[PDB]
Amino acid sequence: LAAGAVILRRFAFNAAEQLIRDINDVASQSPFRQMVTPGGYTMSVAMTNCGHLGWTTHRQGYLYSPIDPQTNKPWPAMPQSFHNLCQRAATAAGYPDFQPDACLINRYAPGAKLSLHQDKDEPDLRAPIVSVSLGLPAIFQFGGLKRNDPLKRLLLEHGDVVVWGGESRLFYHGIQPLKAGFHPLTIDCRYNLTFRQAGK
């Protein structure tokens, strides 16, 4: 896909059913919620987290916290299925020592989108981003270090895993408005699992 980035198409296909079962378990403790940006806007994507740290929004500035600001309780621990799939994907991508301490779970309803951004809330740039697609297909935008750099448009389907790091760790990326559709395992949405090393 780019220097230090690759797309493992259908890599998580066999694990998908189990991953989704665990998403449901995580959501039981920390429900999906549409976060409000530091700017005061409700995101179309619904999110939740598991692992030691969870990505969240604050009155002013994104940040990681071990506490779910909605439930006021710790985020659920990282499911075994998540941990194992993530490490296998990272190894295949060329990052064998990846040890994530956070997993952001995104749920896209039809029309939902995640505008172009950089994952720049993690201090240790040596750790890659492992992104798992589940359910409905979406168009993933992958660019460069500048918001105006040319964008690649790649369809991401159920089971696809994208890993980026090294030279492309801070590349801009996003998801275009989700097209309506149906998928036997997620029904009416697309889920995405984003593993990161947010601390240390």
Ligand SMILES: O=C(O)CCC(=O)C(=O)O
């Ligand atoms: O849904 C995706 O494929 C991308 C999600 C993403 O960029 C994020 O969680 O920071």
Ligand SMILES: [Mn+2]
């Ligand atoms: Mn991102």
